[PDB]
Design a protein around this ligand. Structure first.
Ligand SMILES: NC(=O)c1ccc[n+]([C@@H]2O[C@H](COP(=O)([O-])OP(=O)(O)OC[C@H]3O[C@@H](n4cnc5c(N)ncnc54)[C@H](OP(=O)(O)O)[C@@H]3O)[C@@H](O)[C@H]2O)c1
Ligand SMILES: NC(=O)c1ccc[n+]([C@@H]2O[C@H](COP(=O)([O-])OP(=O)(O)OC[C@H]3O[C@@H](n4cnc5c(N)ncnc54)[C@H](OP(=O)(O)O)[C@@H]3O)[C@@H](O)[C@H]2O)c1
Ligand SMILES: NC(=O)c1ccc[n+]([C@@H]2O[C@H](COP(=O)([O-])OP(=O)(O)OC[C@H]3O[C@@H](n4cnc5c(N)ncnc54)[C@H](OP(=O)(O)O)[C@@H]3O)[C@@H](O)[C@H]2O)c1
Ligand SMILES: NC(=O)c1ccc[n+]([C@@H]2O[C@H](COP(=O)([O-])OP(=O)(O)OC[C@H]3O[C@@H](n4cnc5c(N)ncnc54)[C@H](OP(=O)(O)O)[C@@H]3O)[C@@H](O)[C@H]2O)c1
Ligand SMILES: O=C1OCc2cccc3cccc1c23
Ligand SMILES: O=C1OCc2cccc3cccc1c23
Ligand SMILES: O=C1OCc2cccc3cccc1c23
Ligand SMILES: O=C1OCc2cccc3cccc1c23
Lengths: 181, 196, 196, 181
């Protein structure tokens, strides 16, 4: 029976902290594969103009291509409308009927899981892993999550470098598509 | 007026020869950008092409790091067999003020010119055919008649000794394709078992 | 006058936190280039440092792709314990008309200032101490007395949560260091078994 | 008993053709490792100003770092003076006393092996593999060797791109050290 990580996030942009965290969780929980799932998002979020879903999807593919055990799923961006994790996990249970699912996202996101739709079903579909920076549900501290997507966007908007914060290839993709500037 | 290269190919897989050729042509013809366009439904050969979404992602992975390369879904998001007149009509629509230079392998360019309407082709773009060492194709022989002035150029690219067919055969034989094919693309091919 | 960063460290291994810090400092202080200087013989700690040639090659591998980073052998090619006055005297000799900015971790900068001669240090360069989140080091406390005007700046770099010690421990535990440490450096560490 | 490839060349610059060729030979001959050995060279060669040995060595390290089965040796550049392959192989026999050596270089170089010093000893120390472009000693045809160091230098000197001909990292190293321009 396979152990499948599900790395859910808006990924605007994906950055090296996300990749460190997925790598650590896969090793710690002996996961066979980690499926990255970019969230579906409208044009605006928390006072924020979220990059179009295709761009966030492509950046996540670029960032994960070199890892033999990472893949990327369009399940949330192609569902249409708002993402509810119960729908994410239902879709992946259908696609991988014989795998145990481990849902991985930021601990600050999972703090509100009892307010997520259908929280009762969530805990029947997967185990949950919250990754956090230092300072039912398992918590994993990841120093590299000091890197945040918000800081990456701020720097890119200010024409300041995001090399090494963000994977090679993603940096150039951000710049040539002018995602944040 | 921007000068845009339009790099048309099936890219199954994209390899370093394609990338060298686009880079050399962009420099030689002073192109501001090269737009890679993976074929949606390439012409059938006597040969099971990888799903278009995989070839699209491989092309994105391969071109991401180049500030002057981008990838278009124009052919992938058009039903039916892919024809270059339709590729260029869509790109003209998306870039109405740009001068377009369609770049592909010399043999495919010969096929385009024997089937598709020249009045449309040479109104939309100029054409660049790239070829590998030892492949002897004359401009007289690439078409059955005289071509519009400055409508077609031919460029030999040594790195096009690397071919997608050889990459697929090697991958099927569990032989390495490192350095023939970009890092990232090699791993993408392996983990999705595209040629196994 | 060029403005040159001098990134001094043992780099065992170099990691993405070092590279972020150099990049951020170069942008913030308008540096034209950052010269990485791996220590030749770092001060002994209660800790067996990798041979200097390995740390030099890892730093070259990590910095190669940045047009504004280079690597110097100044400390590696000097016998005896590495001291920053000697590092900066050699770099001043190699770049006599440049303004030098010595960049290192805040704790190492505290050690430099407690042992090495200030008249020489602040004649040769200005100093930038970089620190990770939650590491509380005041500029009052980094030295035992008032510092020359504009002689020292402190910059917090979130990515310096990544530490070389954690990378070495993980590698020793057969745990992944992908994404903490540049591609290429990870493979170099593994195939030379540096921390196994 | 290990099978060790010895990839000898001036590597000015190392390029993707060299790496393809070493990769193919290692697979075809089941080599456990390929040791790249940059040749010792004076300031001038065949009417050519050869890059300093340290630069050619570093470029070869940068180019091979990511391959778990490639390494780089300073044996020729640190010997001092002209490189004779009998000395290269004697040095590596000393360093790897229990390995069978396979010396790999361009077929046009090996064509003159009977004029190399001590050719009698060469064939007692190693098997020889000549890699060639299409168009005792084994020959391996490598399409990617259409890429040549000479063409890379000409393009770099003309401010024309060498991306994709030469590994990432090597390209930027060439440019920022102004090796050929
Ligand atoms: N009702 C629901 O079902 C519901 C509601 C909320 C969230 N969620 C799910 O929660 C996940 C995260 O949502 P979001 O990214 O949009 O949240 P967010 O509000 O944008 O981010 C909250 C925090 O989580 C971090 N983060 C997000 N994804 C991460 C990941 N995979 N690994 C590490 N840190 C991560 C963020 O840092 P970065 O900015 O650096 O990523 C941030 O610190 C998604 O899968 C989403 O569908 C579900
Ligand atoms: N009959 C036709 O195939 C035909 C007809 C009309 C239009 N087109 C258009 O022509 C383009 C090429 O189609 P295809 O790739 O499917 O042809 P193909 O028949 O698979 O390839 C023919 C030759 O061209 C080379 N090649 C293809 N695209 C290249 C590129 N952009 N740069 C360099 N070499 C290239 C191939 O090498 P690799 O295998 O190494 O790529 C091969 O040697 C596409 O835009 C397609 O829509 C093709
Ligand atoms: N007592 C001393 O160590 C001492 C005295 C005189 C001169 N120096 C000079 O100070 C520099 C640092 O020496 P070291 O690395 O051997 O010190 P260290 O004692 O190994 O490191 C002390 C702290 O500084 C960080 N660090 C070191 N170099 C850094 C850099 N360039 N950027 C960001 N963080 C850095 C280290 O993190 P990481 O482990 O993650 O790098 C660690 O947290 C060298 O140029 C050395 O010659 C040191
Ligand atoms: N007396 C002797 O013992 C003697 C004499 C001559 C050569 N050699 C040895 O032969 C080797 C090659 O010498 P060199 O590079 O200086 O020759 P070269 O004269 O610069 O090159 C001759 C041809 O070989 C190719 N080539 C060189 N090394 C290659 C490699 N490892 N793989 C693939 N192609 C390669 C070159 O293409 P690129 O320009 O693209 O590399 C060129 O086409 C060295 O190990 C050298 O010590 C020994
Ligand atoms: O090819 C590789 O480089 C990038 C990378 C990142 C993370 C994990 C990995 C595992 C194997 C191989 C690679 C890898
Ligand atoms: O940043 C870069 O890295 C990768 C790359 C590949 C090919 C062409 C390129 C041109 C400019 C800048 C880059 C580049
Ligand atoms: O070509 C490049 O690729 C890699 C890279 C890494 C870090 C900073 C950089 C600045 C300019 C250009 C490049 C770059
Ligand atoms: O990490 C990798 O990327 C680059 C590369 C090149 C050649 C062979 C290789 C084998 C394993 C892993 C890698 C690799």
């Amino acid at each position: 029976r396979r152990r499948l990580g599900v790395m859910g996030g808006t990924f605007d942009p994906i950055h090296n902290g996300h990749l460190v965290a997925a790598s650590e969780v896969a090793d710690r929980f002996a996961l066979d594969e980690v499926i990255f799932v970019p969230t579906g998002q409208p044009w605006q979020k928390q006072g924020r103009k979220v990059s179009p879903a295709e761009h966030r999807y492509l950046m996540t593919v670029i960032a994960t291509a070199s890892n033999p055990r990472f893949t990327v799923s369009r399940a949330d961006i192609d569902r249409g409308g708002a993402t509810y994790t119960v729908d994410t996990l239902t879709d992946l249970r259908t696609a991988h009927p014989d795998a145990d699912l481990y849902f991985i996202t930021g601990a600050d996101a999972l703090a509100s899981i009892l307010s997520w739709e259908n929280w009762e079903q969530l805990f029947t579909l997967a185990k949950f892993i919250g990754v956090s920076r230092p300072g039912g549900l398992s918590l994993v501290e990841v120093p590299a999550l000091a890197i945040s997507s918000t800081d990456c966007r701020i720097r890119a908007g200010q024409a300041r470098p995001i090399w090494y914060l963000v994977p090679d290839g993603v940096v150039q993709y951000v710049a040539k598509h002018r995602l944040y500037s």
